[PDB]
Amino acid sequence: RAEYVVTKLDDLINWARRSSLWPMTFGLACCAVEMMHMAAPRYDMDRFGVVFRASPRQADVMIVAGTLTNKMAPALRKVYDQMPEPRYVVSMGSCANGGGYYHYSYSVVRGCDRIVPVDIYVPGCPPTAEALLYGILQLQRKIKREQKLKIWYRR
Amino acid sequence: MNLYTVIFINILLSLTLILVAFWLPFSMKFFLVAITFLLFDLEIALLLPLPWAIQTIKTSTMMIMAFILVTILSLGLAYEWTQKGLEWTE
Amino acid sequence: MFFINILTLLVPILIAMAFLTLVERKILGYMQLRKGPNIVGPYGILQPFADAMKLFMKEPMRPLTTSMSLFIIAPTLSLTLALSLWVPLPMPHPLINLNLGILFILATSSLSVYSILWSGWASNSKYSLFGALRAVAQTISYEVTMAIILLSVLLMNGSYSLQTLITTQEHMWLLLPAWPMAMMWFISTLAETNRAPFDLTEGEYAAGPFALFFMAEYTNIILMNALTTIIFLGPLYYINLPELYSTNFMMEALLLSSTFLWIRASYPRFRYDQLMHLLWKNFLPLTLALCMWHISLPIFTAGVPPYM
Amino acid sequence: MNNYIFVLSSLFLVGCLGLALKPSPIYGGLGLIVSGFVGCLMVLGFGGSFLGLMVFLIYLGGMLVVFGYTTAMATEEYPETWGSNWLILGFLVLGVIMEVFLICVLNYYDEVGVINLDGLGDWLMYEVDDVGVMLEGGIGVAAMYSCATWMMVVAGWSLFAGIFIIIEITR
Amino acid sequence: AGRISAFLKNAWAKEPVLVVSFSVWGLAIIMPMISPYTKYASMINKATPYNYPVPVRDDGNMPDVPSHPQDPLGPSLDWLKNL
Amino acid sequence: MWFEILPGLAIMGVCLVIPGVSTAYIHKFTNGGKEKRVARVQYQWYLMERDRRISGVNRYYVSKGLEN
Amino acid sequence: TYKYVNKKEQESEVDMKSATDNAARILMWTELIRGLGMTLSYLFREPATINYPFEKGPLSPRFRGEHALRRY
Amino acid sequence: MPSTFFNLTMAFSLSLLGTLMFRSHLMSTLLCLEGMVLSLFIMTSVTSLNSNSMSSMPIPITILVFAACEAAVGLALLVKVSNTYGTDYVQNLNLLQC
Numbered sequence A: 001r002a003e004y005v006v007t008k009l010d011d012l013i014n015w016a017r018r019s020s021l022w023p024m025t026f027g028l029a030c031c032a033v034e035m036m037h038m039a040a041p042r043y044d045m046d047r048f049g050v051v052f053r054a055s056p057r058q059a060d061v062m063i064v065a066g067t068l069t070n071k072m073a074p075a076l077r078k079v080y081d082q083m084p085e086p087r088y089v090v091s092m093g094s095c096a097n098g099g100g101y102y103h104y105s106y107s108v109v110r111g112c113d114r115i116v117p118v119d120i121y122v123p124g125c126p127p128t129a130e131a132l133l134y135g136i137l138q139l140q141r142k143i144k145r146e147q148k149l150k151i152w153y154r155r
Numbered sequence B: 001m002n003l004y005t006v007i008f009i010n011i012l013l014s015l016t017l018i019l020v021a022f023w024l025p026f027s028m029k030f031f032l033v034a035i036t037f038l039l040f041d042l043e044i045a046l047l048l049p050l051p052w053a054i055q056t057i058k059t060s061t062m063m064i065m066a067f068i069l070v071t072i073l074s075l076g077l078a079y080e081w082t083q084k085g086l087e088w089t090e
Numbered sequence C: 001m002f003f004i005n006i007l008t009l010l011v012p013i014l015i016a017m018a019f020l021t022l023v024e025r026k027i028l029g030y031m032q033l034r035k036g037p038n039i040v041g042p043y044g045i046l047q048p049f050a051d052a053m054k055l056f057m058k059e060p061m062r063p064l065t066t067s068m069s070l071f072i073i074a075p076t077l078s079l080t081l082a083l084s085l086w087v088p089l090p091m092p093h094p095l096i097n098l099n100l101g102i103l104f105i106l107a108t109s110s111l112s113v114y115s116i117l118w119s120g121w122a123s124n125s126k127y128s129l130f131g132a133l134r135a136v137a138q139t140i141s142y143e144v145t146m147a148i149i150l151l152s153v154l155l156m157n158g159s160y161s162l163q164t165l166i167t168t169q170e171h172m173w174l175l176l177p178a179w180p181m182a183m184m185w186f187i188s189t190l191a192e193t194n195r196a197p198f199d200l201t202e203g204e205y206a207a208g209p210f211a212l213f214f215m216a217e218y219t220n221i222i223l224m225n226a227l228t229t230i231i232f233l234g235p236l237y238y239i240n241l242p243e244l245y246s247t248n249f250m251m252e253a254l255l256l257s258s259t260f261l262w263i264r265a266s267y268p269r270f271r272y273d274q275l276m277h278l279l280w281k282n283f284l285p286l287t288l289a290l291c292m293w294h295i296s297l298p299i300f301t302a303g304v305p306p307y308m
Numbered sequence D: 001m002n003n004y005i006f007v008l009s010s011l012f013l014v015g016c017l018g019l020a021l022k023p024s025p026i027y028g029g030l031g032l033i034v035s036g037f038v039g040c041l042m043v044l045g046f047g048g049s050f051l052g053l054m055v056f057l058i059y060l061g062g063m064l065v066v067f068g069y070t071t072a073m074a075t076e077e078y079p080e081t082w083g084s085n086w087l088i089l090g091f092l093v094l095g096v097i098m099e100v101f102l103i104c105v106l107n108y109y110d111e112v113g114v115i116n117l118d119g120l121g122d123w124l125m126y127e128v129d130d131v132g133v134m135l136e137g138g139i140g141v142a143a144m145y146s147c148a149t150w151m152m153v154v155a156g157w158s159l160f161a162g163i164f165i166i167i168e169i170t171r
Numbered sequence E: 001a002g003r004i005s006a007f008l009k010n011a012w013a014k015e016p017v018l019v020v021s022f023s024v025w026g027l028a029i030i031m032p033m034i035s036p037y038t039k040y041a042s043m044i045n046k047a048t049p050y051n052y053p054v055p056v057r058d059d060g061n062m063p064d065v066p067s068h069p070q071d072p073l074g075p076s077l078d079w080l081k082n083l
Numbered sequence F: 001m002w003f004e005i006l007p008g009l010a011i012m013g014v015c016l017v018i019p020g021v022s023t024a025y026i027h028k029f030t031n032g033g034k035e036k037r038v039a040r041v042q043y044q045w046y047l048m049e050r051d052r053r054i055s056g057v058n059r060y061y062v063s064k065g066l067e068n
Numbered sequence G: 001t002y003k004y005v006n007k008k009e010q011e012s013e014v015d016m017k018s019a020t021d022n023a024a025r026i027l028m029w030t031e032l033i034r035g036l037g038m039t040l041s042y043l044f045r046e047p048a049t050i051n052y053p054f055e056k057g058p059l060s061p062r063f064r065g066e067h068a069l070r071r072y
Numbered sequence H: 001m002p003s004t005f006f007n008l009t010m011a012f013s014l015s016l017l018g019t020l021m022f023r024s025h026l027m028s029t030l031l032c033l034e035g036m037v038l039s040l041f042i043m044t045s046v047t048s049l050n051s052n053s054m055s056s057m058p059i060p061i062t063i064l065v066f067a068a069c070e071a072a073v074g075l076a077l078l079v080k081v082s083n084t085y086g087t088d089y090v091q092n093l094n095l096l097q098c
């Protein structure tokens, strides 16, 4: 059936999109040294296919790492808009998950999920590079579990 | 015919790739640089026929003229140098 | 048969670029005390196909203030030249046997400035135009020595043909003589290809165009190293063993293309002003001096070469 | 292939027509580049290997390059030019057709005169040494170094003095 | 001698590239007069037969020109081999 | 370890060796087991056209020899 | 107690020997081949990388991760 | 030969027409001048190759050199005009009428 080949086509597209993840590392604060340590040898970001840091204009995933303020939210939103679909976002840290240690402040956004839509939340202050890697692989699986062509076919 | 075929093929391949791509889903320093490059590229034009000139009999003459070319080119370079034409410190 | 020869020439060089990407990544990793790609396929041999699929499957956010004409014909031109350069190369017998072949190389290399400049003038900004002007000036400046070096080294073989260098080095490389001309030629290949430490233009395009630019870049890299091998490192040519010639040529070209990445990982970048000072104050004087030296050498020596 | 050189010369004509009509200093550069490519092609057709490759490597790689360079750095594109660009493209079409009618009338008025359409593929090469070596164009362009050294000194002096002239003009 | 030699050492330290350029310039302009192997270049490029040697009539008075390629009355470039 | 870049180095090496030997073999095949004759000047072109004319099958590489 | 960085104990010698040594350093590109050698040495070592989901990084009995409410 | 020469002369004439008819720019005139240069280069090389006169090949080289120099000085003048007025326009050179 066409269903078989369509499933295989979606699987191939998702394999590519998940094996060639390129991150825009919107690194604001002390949840970025861990991303650096994850690129470092012991974890070798580049080993799964995730380049160290590419340009925000040809990137696929976007890692929000650290406290997002009300003076920095518009630039993050502009970057998200400039980014090309299909684009995914990963929130690394308490600061970006809910504001964290500054949630009750006047110059902090209580969650990057108010400025942009998020796919994977990584908890920690800071979360080890191992946890960030776990989260990126969780994103890989979230991608592998897509059915775009199937939903366009049975429409 | 063969060169034509090869270049046509390359052009077709490039356009095909770039179609699939869409169908799947003032400072005077730069001017002076360009001018210097002109004045050296024309020297290349005057210098390229040496592999045919060194086959002649008037070796004492080709030696001379090539040395003249290179020497006066080096002098023009040195003057553009002394006059601060290779600096970039606006 | 000729179309089959064209396929045999084009397909492998594209595969070789796609895998030179991976070789770069792995070498840089192991020099940085890491592995590089290991997963997508055995040792990573599927990562380039994965990346190609990803890019060509993305969605192109074409700048609105632009011109589609210059947006499409820039990478088309880049790839066309990067492929048409490989044509005259004797490996050992060439697909197209030209006289004035190195001149065809010079010209079809100098023709890329047009794309690297139209892209900038198309992108409606001032920063992109600044970068484009600077890169054009760099490429231009280094073309001068790229030309004079050959102009002076083509007097040990009195012809602009590439099929004469084989017999010119039938007994000894053209490196022992002109090793000061190579050291200046090996570098102008970096600055010409905007390769580190001369990457002041990549240190603004959609998926497909960026991919074509990447292809052109790495193809030009392999080709410049191939020219180095053919000119200054003349391989073995036993009339009956084109296989031997091709093996040695491949080995040396891979050595050189790995040296480029060795360098990228080993050294810092340059500053545009210092990069231009380099040429206009160290390479051009020595180049002209050695040009005079090599015009005189075949005379005060009786070793002036022939015109066949 | 009898129509080869004629097609090339016609493309050169159209390029120079797109120059005469002045779209902008950048599309004019593209037209110049096309015309020069075609000029080299026809020179090679007539046997000028060195001349054509020199055109390639110097006129395009050296002259039109700085033309576009100076254009970008010292020129601004104004929005009006687009409607007028379309207008002059229509003008170019009309000029092409007028030239076709011109050529027709000239063939009707001079069969073996202006253009011998019957003898198009002919009258390209008149004579050639069949058993002759040493008859390319480099053998002539390299005369300069033995005979006609006067031309070489002239050109070298022009280039030399151009340095001083440009530094004094820009300053 | 001392002052100029100190100048040359200062250069040799500061800008060896200029020194090398100028010295190669001098070598180029000088060696072709020292060398004995220079003349041979013109000799060879003359000896190369890119054309047909159109013969001449045997009008009697021409003893120093041969009637066959294999006669010793004409030039003989054994010096090229011995070179 | 350092011996894991070879899976790619050798791939590229094979892809860079193919052009040369492919062209050589195709030349030997299309030109009668002989190299493709080059023509840098008009003399060689004349020799080639002459061989072609004396062949009798309109092919420059059909050498005839003494028998004819 | 202090030290000096980028200060020489005294002037140098302009001897032909040292001048030629510096000119060799400049022309022959000497101080850069050593960096190339460092990179080659690192290429010929063992990387510190680990298969993550199969090989895990080492921790301590004091690690502070996820929370838990205990029992008796 | 006759046809290509007729077309080359027509092209030179068209480029001279462009020069003598300004259209508010100056680059669009320098480019017509360079088109003229190119046409003359081509005609000269073609006549040389047709007549087999290898004692006339330096002529294209010389004219190319000198056209390059002319273009360089013209570009410099255009650069000054822009630096002063802001545009490579020709209505701004309305001085000297007094």
Ligand SMILES: CCCCCCCCCCCCCCCCCC(=O)OC[C@H](COP(=O)(O)OCCN)OC(=O)CCCCCCCCCCCCCCCCC
Residues within 6 Å of the ligand: B001, B003, B004, B007, B008, B011, C073, C076, C077, C080, C081, C084, C097, C098, C099, C100, C104, C108, D034, D037, D041, D044, D045, D049, D050, D053, F039, F040
């Ligand atoms: C929309 C995208 C646009 C992008 C397009 C970019 C295309 C650029 C491609 C690179 C340009 C390559 C330039 C080709 C020059 C050829 C020079 C040459 O050496 O050929 C000469 C050839 C052999 O002569 P020779 O070597 O002297 O001696 C032979 C005797 N045995 O003798 C000959 O003369 C062979 C016949 C000439 C063949 C040349 C054809 C070149 C390819 C044509 C490209 C056409 C593209 C479309 C039109 C361009 C715009 C108008």
Ligand SMILES: CCCCCCCCCCCCCCCCCC(=O)OC[C@H](COP(=O)(O)OCCN)OC(=O)CCCCCCCCCCCCCCCCC
Residues within 6 Å of the ligand: C180, C182, C183, C184, C186, C187, C197, C228, C232, C263, C278, C282, C286, C293, E017, E020, E024, G026, G027, G028, G029, G032
């Ligand atoms: C018969 C007797 C006489 C015969 C005449 C000839 C005699 C010999 C003449 C000597 C020739 C010397 C060699 C020629 C090249 C020299 C160029 C040079 O020296 O560049 C200088 C420049 C630094 O200059 P500067 O900034 O002033 O120095 C710092 C001041 N403290 O240095 C640089 O900036 C260079 C930048 C290099 C960056 C990249 C380095 C990568 C190196 C990779 C290895 C390459 C090895 C060669 C590969 C060969 C290719 C096959």
Ligand code: SF4
Residues within 6 Å of the ligand: A029, A030, A031, A032, A065, A066, A067, A092, A093, A094, A095, A096, A100, A101, A124, A125, A126, A127
């Ligand atoms: S969550 Fe903690 S470690 Fe991360 S950015 Fe905020 S304060 Fe820094």
